[PDB]
């Protein structure tokens, strides 16, 4: 039974944007949760449905590892039952969520002198997302009463905005990578266990 591919998920070179967060399925391997927890780099490690020490023994059906880069101040919104731009329009965690949220500062990778503006987030949306929705559409918004009809006027905003990551921005505005592990702990044939 081979080791789980956590190294790829946590040491990937380039992370995805917020609005198009990549989901990596994991299954049929021996998970090693001790390694990740023991490391000290992870600024915020929060497990919701379970306890972090229990993880070494539980057996799950399969687990999803999401990844994206968000601003430091908005990390809180990645949690069940909160709101904001990220929760409402980008990435909504369902209530009764069961998994672990992992985040760490990445100012030495995702921020370069002159600013890094390649990480985008959705700002204007008609309605909130359903849990784990991944709306990648770039439909022209309409904040004015007049119909926009696909012409980007002064009230026909493009619904994506790019973060501005200066190398010397405050800790609040520095880019934090986020990995969310979601364990759907059904009683279907267990595929991922800890030694």
């Amino acid at each position: 039974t081979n080791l789980c591919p956590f190294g790829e998920v946590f040491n990937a070179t380039r992370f995805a944007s917020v609005y198009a967060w990549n989901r990596k399925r994991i299954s049929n391997c021996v998970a090693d949760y001790s390694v990740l927890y023991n490391s000290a780099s992870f600024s915020t490690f929060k497990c919701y449905g379970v306890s972090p020490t229990k993880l070494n023994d539980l057996c799950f059906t399969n687990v999803y590892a999401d990844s994206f880069v968000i601003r430091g101040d908005e990390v809180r919104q990645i949690a069940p039952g909160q709101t904001g731009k990220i929760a409402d329009y980008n990435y909504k965690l369902p209530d009764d969520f069961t998994g672990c949220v992992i985040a760490w500062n990445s100012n030495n990778l995702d921020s370069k002198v002159g600013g890094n503006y390649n990480y985008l987030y959705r700002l204007f949306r008609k309605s909130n997302l359903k849990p784990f929705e991944r709306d990648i559409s770039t439909e022209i918004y309409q904040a004015g009463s007049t119909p926009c009809n696909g012409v980007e006027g002064f009230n026909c905003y493009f619904p994506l905005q790019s973060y501005g990551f200066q190398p010397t921005n405050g800790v609040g505005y520095q880019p934090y990578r986020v990995v969310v592990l979601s364990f759907e702990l059904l009683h279907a044939p267990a595929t991922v266990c800890g030694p």
């Epitope: 002159g114 600013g115 503006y117 985008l120 980007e152 002064f154 905003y157 493009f158 790019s162 501005g164």
Partner: antibody
Framework: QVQLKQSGPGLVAPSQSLSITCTVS????????ISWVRQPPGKGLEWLGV???????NYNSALKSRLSISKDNSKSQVFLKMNSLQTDDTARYYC??????????????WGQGTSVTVS | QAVVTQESALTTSPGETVTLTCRSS?????????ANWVQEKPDHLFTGLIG???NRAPGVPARFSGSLIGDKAALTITGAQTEDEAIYFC?????????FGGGTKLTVL
Amino acid sequence: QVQLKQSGPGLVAPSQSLSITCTVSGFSLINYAISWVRQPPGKGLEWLGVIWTGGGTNYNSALKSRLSISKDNSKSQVFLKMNSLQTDDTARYYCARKDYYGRYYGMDYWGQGTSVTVS
Amino acid sequence: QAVVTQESALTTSPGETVTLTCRSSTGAVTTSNYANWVQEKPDHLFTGLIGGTNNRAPGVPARFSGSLIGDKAALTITGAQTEDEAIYFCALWYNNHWVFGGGTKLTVL
């Protein structure tokens, strides 16, 4: 710091087409729009056209539709192209930033200007 | 429907405020036609002063202030001689395009 650069020797011969480039730092092309204006020597400036935040253009009405503006978000560059030039077009051209998402609904910042002279 | 006109002649002694009016060809300027004020340095340097008919650009001194004080758009300034020798142009957003006025030459004292 927000900054606008545009560069080119410029000088043109009649009936050919030459293009100018605008290079930007300190702001992202997704959060703003870029407008181009043209300044014949000693006269009032006229507005050529705008490239909106994510593509899609407007142009000056009577100005020739045989011209286009284009951009590259990756390198933070903007290009104006005209496909045929006439001697009245000899002018200084300027890049400009339009901040219509937030507070300042006009041309927030302006470039250093490039001379384009035909003959 | 594109003609916009300015006086193009101005003089304010230091400390005294003046108003320059830019007027459209659609009657009194609407709020929709957002007003813009730009400043011309004598070395071919440009900057933006007022947008949206009320908003100062970031980093412009609070001494500068404007609005639709009269039915046509206009701008006002308290007199600071050294840094206010400049040309100023008014711009109006018609829904189809932006139109720029001829511009007004300010000659303080």
